[PDB]
Amino acid sequence: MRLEFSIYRYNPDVDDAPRMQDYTLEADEGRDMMLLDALIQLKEKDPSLSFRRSCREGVCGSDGLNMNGKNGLACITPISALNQPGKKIVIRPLPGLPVIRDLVVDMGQFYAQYEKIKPYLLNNGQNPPAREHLQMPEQREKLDGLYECILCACCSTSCPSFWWNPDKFIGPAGLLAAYRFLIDSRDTETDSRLDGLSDAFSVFRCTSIMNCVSVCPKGLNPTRAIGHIKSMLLQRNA
Amino acid sequence: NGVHDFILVRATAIVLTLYIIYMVGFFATSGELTYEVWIGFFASAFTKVFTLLALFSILIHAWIGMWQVLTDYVKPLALRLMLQLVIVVALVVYVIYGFVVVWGV
Amino acid sequence: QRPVNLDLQTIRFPITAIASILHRVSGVITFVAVGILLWLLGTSLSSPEGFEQASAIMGSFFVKFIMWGILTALAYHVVVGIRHMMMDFGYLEETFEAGKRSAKISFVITVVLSLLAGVLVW
Amino acid sequence: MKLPVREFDAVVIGAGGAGMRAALQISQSGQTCALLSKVFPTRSHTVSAQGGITVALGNTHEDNWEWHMYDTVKGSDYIGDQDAIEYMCKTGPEAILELEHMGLPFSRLDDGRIYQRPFGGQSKNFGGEQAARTAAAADRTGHALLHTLYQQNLKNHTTIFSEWYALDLVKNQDGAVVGCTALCIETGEVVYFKARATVLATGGAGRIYQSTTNAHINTGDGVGMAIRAGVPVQDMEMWQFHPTGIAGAGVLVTEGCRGEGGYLLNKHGERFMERYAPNAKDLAGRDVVARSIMIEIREGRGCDGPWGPHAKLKLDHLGKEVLESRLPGILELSRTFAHVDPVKEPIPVIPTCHYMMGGIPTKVTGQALTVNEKGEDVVVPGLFAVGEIACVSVHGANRLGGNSLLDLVVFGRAAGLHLQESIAEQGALRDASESDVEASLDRLNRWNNNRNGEDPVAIRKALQECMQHNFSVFREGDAMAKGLEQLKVIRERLKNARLDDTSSEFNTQRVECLELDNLMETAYATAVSANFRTESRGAHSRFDFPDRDDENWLCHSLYLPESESMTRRSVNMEPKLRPAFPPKIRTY
């Protein structure tokens, strides 16, 4: 069976602006591949096609793409979920970020927002434990749904608030991370972290658009994490 | 700060929701709208106060809200401050014009 | 300088996002509308002559259409704003499912108010 | 100099577990350090590690680092260096508790301590009852570890060169390694990173095979770099084939499945690991479990279907709750890649190329080793290696589950603790000259100028098929000799291979071509080594020499790049804190 693609191309030493290019791929009928399988095959026939990938199992977060208008990872998006009689499969870079080449975006501003919220254990050293910090299962469960984030940027690049202020709004992924440290029992800087999240932009630009949740390949929920941050902010500053 | 906005915008939204329930109540339960029953409603101390309160609430709530919109879509600083000026003055005008319309009844 | 993919016509938006952009648009509309309603109110209160004049303006089919738009945009901003606040206060869940249901119910409620508005204006 | 020069005390090539640990440590110890990675650091293969970290914390039951030592030495089938294994198991607890204080989100016991699960090759009392010493974060431990380390590197302000591709080591006229050249993937700029210590931490090379659990980025760049610099590589024939890759996909499902109570069945529903390993059963060492599955298949007791030949891994008796809580990750992987829900059906699994026991030989300090003409060890001044790229060797002929992550942390840290002593010991190194640097670029230059040569896609497929058919779980004298011959042909083709994309802005073709040279050196070294070792030990199994030969092969095998020939190195058997564990018959 024939597969048809419309893929985003852009190379600054050749192209004046971006363009969509058509691609065909004979597929085995009785077997269903992932979009990444297709991409890798397209590259055999057009070696100039650049895209990121690595683990090919939805864990490393390399290959976030906008597929038929919706973000996800190529490596776990089956062709059968994208294919429509008489339409092309449309593949474009994650929205809102500068495009380096073809389907490769500059994630710098995404990583910058992550660093802004200080994503590392902050522990004041008082009352050191004999061995590991003791964390009861109940306290540990609070991290579930937060630490699994693969920093793929599917969520933030699908958030309008992030598009309009990528340098002021932390964005869903980052705020998800901030909350991971805000509720880690082993982190003692909760108040100080909240004082850095009180301005009009960091958290409050999130207005429950809820595009974050539907695209997360790991099934995480930024909206809910953000909601919790908002409560903590009010409990402290209101 | 943003916690301040978050709260004021919501406090005023609660007040305004009450005012709308009040004005809808009236409009939905009077039938024949003569000039006299109209002027009678707006002569009432209750209606005068509630209405002025609503205008203050709109001043605060819409100022916050319009600010949010502008700071998303209007990047150049000069054009933005000007639009804020217009909008703030308009809202203040609203409240003042509201005072003059009702104290005159 | 590097291109960016932000062609809104190539991106799918789920119902929750539609709901949200409409809430923003309805709010801007309502801000302008307040002036108009005030302009109208003040006319209708200045004298008995002002009142008949206001009724006559309300007579016009074109004006009824706009007044209906104003009331509809307002009902929309209000209802969807309440949805927002129910999430902020924990009355509504924040899962994607819950967000879809609540947007839909919000539309339904708005359409009903829009008719009650249409009736009130006819 | 016609090439920018970026100078640091240390340049760490690779930002997986090993590299990020070392960078952190080098930095805290006060030296400057550039950390290079050809992908954003959190996308390194460590991110995929599932089951956890094997280390004697003693949380789930009383434990002893000597028990862990015994298990490891036995597991390595006696060519693991005992002084190094001693260092690892004894240091381990402290090193791992340290990760917990960096915030790693371990799973927890009811009392709040780090959760440990059973895993293969784990015993109490030197070969007694089954132990549970693998510390875990559900089945996402590698993810947890890598992110925690990246976070620590952010907090320390490590200087990170993300998406730079290291091309080749640079050597001075004295033969010292003095840095490397690298290609910035975004811009195309090529630079010389000048260093007093160049630390290879580039991970494994499963992609020399046709089916592997490894990410696409595991191309043995460290092996190829060492070889081209004249640095020998060791035990290259020791390839661990994980017992349970998903049939038809290669994607791993953790040995955690068996540690939590799962087991393997054949087409008749026999739990055949009771027959092949009466003691440790499904938690026997990996070489044994992998062979057992492949025998079951070869004898027509394996199962079939959409996935191809396979064994069943039964988990459903563990229950939904335990599955979702301790093994959520394989739930996702099985549903996505096998279309099987482990809660209700067994997962179709087959042995799959997984981990590289071989690599650049090193001391405990991370310093790289070579041999002189009398066969004596000599430090390579300026060079170091840590992690899967290294061969310390703590894993010998078969690595224990859980022991790689431990290795990254223990040895990455150790290279950093010892760097000042290592730099002082080696002396000032003489500067690279301009043509010293230029030599590093030859390989890159060939690709840039070759337009009409052979198709590198066909070369890679041939290379991979060759390894799959001839250097897999069971090997044979004849087939290996023929495979080696085919590799020589393939390797000649590659010297004439074309690069079709000539651009400079994020051109991934160039990267992948560069990578293919490293697949080729790694495959070749593997094959030469596999032919050479005429015995069967751990993962290396031959029908023509079925037995373990402790009189002739109680030793490491060493591949010498200049002469392309083989030789031997002693295995160390002199632990400092307890007596050596003597070689004995190894069954599970």
Ligand SMILES: *Cc1cc2c(cc1C)nc1c(=O)[nH]c(=O)nc-1n2C[C@H](O)[C@H](O)[C@H](O)COP(=O)(O)OP(=O)(O)OC[C@H]1O[C@@H](n2cnc3c(N)ncnc32)[C@H](O)[C@@H]1O
């Ligand atoms: C494949 C695998 C391995 C694995 C596992 C699960 C899977 C799917 N689970 C494990 C577990 O539960 N416990 C354990 O003890 N080990 C487990 N393993 C094995 C282990 O994870 C791997 O051996 C280990 O993670 C390797 O770590 P290491 O730090 O040594 O290497 P890496 O993670 O692949 O990092 C490689 C880095 O090097 C950079 N690189 C490579 N080439 C270049 C060049 N040319 N230039 C610049 N950088 C380069 C990569 O970018 C990466 O940063």
Ligand code: HEM
């Ligand atoms: C009376 C005239 C009103 C006007 C002119 C107005 C205008 C606005 C504007 C311009 C915004 C910002 C839009 C955005 O950020 O997308 C806003 C936000 C909001 N509106 Fe109103 N509004 C009015 C009344 C109300 C009422 C009665 C409610 C009660 C439901 C309400 C609910 C909300 C809420 C909850 C927000 C907050 C969302 C956020 O914080 O971003 N509004 N309004």
Ligand SMILES: CC1=C(C(=O)Nc2ccccc2)SCCO1
């Ligand atoms: C940023 C923001 C909105 C946004 O811009 N939405 C949007 C804009 C364009 C296209 C889709 C959605 S609507 C809710 C208030 O916050």
Ligand SMILES: O=C([O-])[C@H](O)C=C([O-])O
């Ligand atoms: O089964 C695993 O989790 C994994 O394969 C463990 C190691 O150590 O490699």
Ligand code: SF4
């Ligand atoms: S929360 Fe989800 S979509 Fe967002 S960065 Fe993490 S894994 Fe990606």
Ligand code: F3S
């Ligand atoms: S998609 Fe964006 S606005 Fe808030 S709920 Fe989401 S972060």
Ligand code: FES
């Ligand atoms: S390639 Fe690693 S997530 Fe898709």
Ligand code: NA
């Ligand atoms: Na190794």
